[PDB]
Chain length 390, copies 4
């Protein structure tokens, strides 16, 4: 079996409690579902199934994958579900949709992710009732999204372990950070993010606001302002708000079919899924995930690391990203060419299909042939996908 991504689409990535602050994740998904359809020239009625990565759906109601597909004009007769491999979710769902077609269970899939970190609620187990004493209202964003369930600290603490252990300085983390911002700023101003970003309409009482730009990219980000910041997690540490990714909203997806079905319907695919892999790692240093995963991926495809023409390797933190690129040995000038998540955002469920978009459209936009994606995952994992142009 041979599967292509016929088309791809993402919302812009919103900043925490910003442009999308009150926008449910499935709203962002419904637009992205309609956009991949409209891009490939496929009708909504032809979709066999909608898969959406999503980490924090508490309070959005029954199966927000189905809400997203239904709002988007997908018929009741198709199916829809969500899944969760954390930061890996958005790219994994694409691998899961790829499997759907390989087995002869579906022909055409919409796969990706969607997150609204903004709309994640606070929660408390209250059925027994609280006879007396204070109790906690738990921020599900932190608890279920960013906190290690075994060691009880933030993801930023796992980045410190990795920084200490590869001997990455506070200066090196900030230089990779200021670089990521600079490459994103240059790309946005260069209209490199136009093709992939589908504009989203935030409906309001005293005004509709059209959002088609990444609002988290800081313009003119310097080395002086970076170096002034405090360590956010470790009191004598190195990882900061500046060289770490942020809390963000967005959605992103890809319409998948068999290669020959694309051809039939006169589509001109953005890429061909040659391989994928997920692998586990020690939770303390989850950020190194992308090393074994990208090496399993590459083995599965039959490529050496030096065959890749372009890479998106997620920037969860400046610490881990640098360590991944140090290990893998790929030319840093092909990595994250239009910047990284430190500049653009980290909408967790969406993140993997958010970079799938950036790589596919840049593979298009420079005539690259081979190209990989990879992301570290909390609790100790990595995921990757190899993509070959047609």
């Amino acid at each position: 079996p041979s599967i292509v991504i016929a088309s791809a689409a993402r919302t812009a990535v919103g900043s925490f409690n910003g442009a999308f602050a009150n926008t449910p994740a499935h709203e962002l998904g419904a637009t992205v579902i309609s956009a991949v359809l409209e891009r490939a020239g496929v009708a909504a009625g032809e979709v066999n199934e909608v898969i959406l990565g999503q980490v924090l759906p508490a309070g959005e109601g029954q199966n927000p994958a189905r809400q997203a597909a239904m709002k988007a004009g997908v018929p009741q007769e198709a199916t829809a579900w969500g899944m969760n491999q954390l930061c890996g979710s958005g790219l994994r769902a694409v691998a899961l949709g790829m499997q759907q077609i390989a087995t002869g269970d579906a022909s055409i899939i919409v796969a990706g992710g969607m997150e609204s970190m903004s709309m994640a609620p606070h929660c408390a187990h209250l059925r027994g009732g609280v006879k007396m004493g204070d109790f906690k209202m738990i921020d599900t964003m932190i608890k279920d999204g960013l906190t290690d369930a075994f060691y009880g600290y933030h993801m930023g603490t796992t980045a410190e372990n990795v920084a200490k252990q590869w001997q990455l300085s506070r200066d090196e983390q900030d230089a990779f950070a200021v670089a990521s911002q600079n490459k994103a700023e240059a790309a946005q101003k260069d209209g490199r993010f136009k093709d992939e970003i589908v504009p989203f309409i935030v409906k309001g009482r005293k005004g509709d606001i059209t959002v088609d730009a990444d609002e988290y990219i800081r313009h003119g980000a310097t080395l002086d302002s970076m170096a002034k910041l405090r360590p956010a997690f470790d009191k004598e540490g190195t990882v900061t708000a500046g060289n770490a990714s942020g809390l963000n909203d967005g959605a992103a997806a890809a319409l998948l079919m068999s290669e020959a079905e694309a051809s039939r319907r006169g589509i001109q695919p953005l890429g061909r899924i040659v391989s994928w892999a997920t692998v586990g790692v020690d939770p303390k240093v989850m950020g190194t995930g992308p090393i074994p995963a990208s090496r399993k991926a590459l083995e599965r495809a039959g490529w050496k690391i030096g065959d890749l023409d372009l890479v998106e390797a997620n920037e969860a933190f400046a610490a881990q990203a640098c360590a991944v690129n140090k290990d893998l040995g790929w030319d840093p000038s092909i990595v994250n060419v239009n910047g990284g998540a430190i500049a653009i955002g980290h909408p967790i469920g969406a993140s993997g299909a958010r970079i799938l978009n950036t790589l596919l459209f840049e593979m298009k936009r420079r005539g690259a042939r081979k190209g990989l994606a990879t992301l570290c995952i909390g609790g100790g994992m990595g995921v990757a996908m190899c993509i070959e142009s047609l």
Copy 2:
């Protein structure tokens, strides 16, 4: 590729705020992951992935699939993820595990679902603040678990939708409920749940307790206690607490590998998987989804309805249970043979793997060669899976 369930186990279904009142989902899943590896005689180090359905993880921490897997002693090596096709999750998880192996993406999987409806919290989105006025704390079990996202009403009102369309009166639904309970109270006492139940140790402070019995099986269910219950959803309706399944906790799973690997390891499998399907229906009448799903999977297997020796059609509601039995027309006597969910419980995320357990052990018990599981799903879907024994 031919894929076989080498083993299968499940916790007892627990009552709502009962024996597993304060037991998180991943503790029950962790018992279930151990008991499948123990029964097959396969170690945890051999497991590539853990795939667990779960509808209600809010509050539980990052990726509880990974938590259940690490507490099982499946090493950091393997990966693990959660997924959500609502009541269908537990069985879909099995189909997906089967998919990982069919595409050569892995060797050995443990697929199923878990659910603590008891531990599901109240929540509200409070980042914007509430400048003034009262607000609602939302019961996530109801909002994300049981309430249709489109018409905004509970699944017991979709059972009024189906009860009117197939003219199923109150005396027909009280007949199916008592007799599910009677079949369920006959199996539990006669030991027919023994094999498929692994006991769970509810760790306390002043007394460890061992649970190993479906506590939600009321003993001596008469028709006269059934007919005096008031309607629970529509004020002049036919769906009461008596002719519907309840809120419950539990976990349920299966070890997957190729037939040639089980054949290899000297494992006599519970059964080969021959097909599966999932189909969407009108969300108003969501309980008719097993009808299309059972028909699609029966075609993918090459079977007829008459070929089936044993069947689990999950009893979400008495209305929709008699609606699938009427349309599909299979012999009533070969279906939900040991009773069903009205009598056992409805642990949503795990319910799919709960009935699949019951099928595979009652397929080994009576010498059935063919068996279909199937389930209705909120938002309007169904899932089916055909199993032949070896």
Copy 3:
């Protein structure tokens, strides 16, 4: 001016989440207002104002004193208000009521207090929003009722402070506690609380229940059972759940008018208010408040300590009650002759009027001429009142 207490009444004191678990404090208040009126032969239309101490009114609605007055049939032309000097409240309200008559502003006042520690809610300030991170739902009973605002610790710690200062052993404290229980039991059995208690009807759904006995009094309390408790505030402490008072519900009040008015009406009053006083102490030793307050009240009356025939010294904690008794040196045999708050309970805003009721009805029973009621107060205060029989 000479002001008398024409009549008094109180409810039984309810155990925490016991008989009165779902009864708003103003319902208890309304019954006691009705009772004082009946008992004095005074009509509700004759009341000028109602003054009710109440520490924990959150969620009860606008000015619960007014709610109580209105429910009791006191006319809309009268007025009502609440006040808060913590445990001193119910007694202070009586002094404030006396002052309305002394200054010629009113003729007829109903004064006392009311409290439902059970119905006190959890709260959080949510207007600003909680942009990110956990937050506490605060138990208002603990925070506004029982925690010192300066040192941050519970009243129980102030008790340890006094235990250490006065070198009071765990054995002396436990003895005092058991004595309280045994006195209260004996008094209850002999009918000594009948005159003071007005029965309260708890209106249900499946039956009304009449409460006319103090439910917190433990019958057959043993020294052993007290000796086996663990310290409740300091892990190497002496103050326990046993030798501390409890968390309780109740109301209590007095009807006041001038001595000349009672004579006009032919009323035989329960007592003349001869003096009162309130004084501050260090918050860390707040249990000592009764010492300066009592001495100041006695000086104002022109009485020596030895002139007192009966004393109600409130038992917040055994440690502080023992310190008070040691310092003042009054004959312990005339203090709390029918037991105290360790046995009976501590409904904060009501307590001072609860112990006035006990003192008044006992002084009548035994023909005692001179009495005194006193309490300690959180944050370092005392209140006392001198009463003489007519």
Copy 4:
């Protein structure tokens, strides 16, 4: 006995979730206590008691009046208490303080009120527990401050009741409202609130901010802007956000002593308390409370309405302030000469002391001999006080 007001002060009145959005009421109180002391030349060590009206103390900790006293340097030997007669509180407190002096129980009292409507929390009674389903988090500001407990509707509905009863047009109410704003703007600009206001320093991480101006007063308020507003309580009503007072934070107080004691110390007092009164009315028309309370206060003083030189009649709503003025018939030109609560705000427990401050400092500046302050009260009450210059 003859009691004087030796000195007075208030904070600026803050807008809802404005300047004082995160300032607990006792911090504002403490600044006002320090101020009255400074202004009278009286030391904190000389204060016997502090009495502070406060409607919304939930979550603030034990007895915020004590907390305010202690922060201001008032010794632990003094006492303090809070009280609640709703909007009447901060004026009622002054009368209560007067009575402590008249009955010989104290020499020096600090009395007024304090309120942080901004900091009032949301709450819910959670001890029994929520077995299942949604429940309400109740805004304590609305529930305990602004909702009638008998009729279940907002104070603004009682204003509509008065508007209908007195036939007061939308246009008359709006004219009154604009006049209030324009009078307050003029007084603010001319420096008339400087004498009464003590500046309050709001402490901040990145800057302390001094607040010495009433921030709620609208500059350049137009009749057209008022006329365009929608009714806020009744869809065919007349009462709007514009012609109602607002939700506000502030504190305000008076230092009291005997006339002879002021003379001993060489203090020129702001006024002698000549009389006070409080009376009840029907809760449905609570806005009329000032009518019988004022008449009763004047009777007690031996004054005719025509004898008054200046009046502060608090403006909870235009409708009721108009009714009061029409009934009493005092010259509108001497009422609220510096504007009123519609413009300045309505910090509920502080308001009666805020208007007394405004009355006193205006009497001083214009040499007015006789003054009256009055407020309406939720639940159907009025309070009034008569003041004469020395």
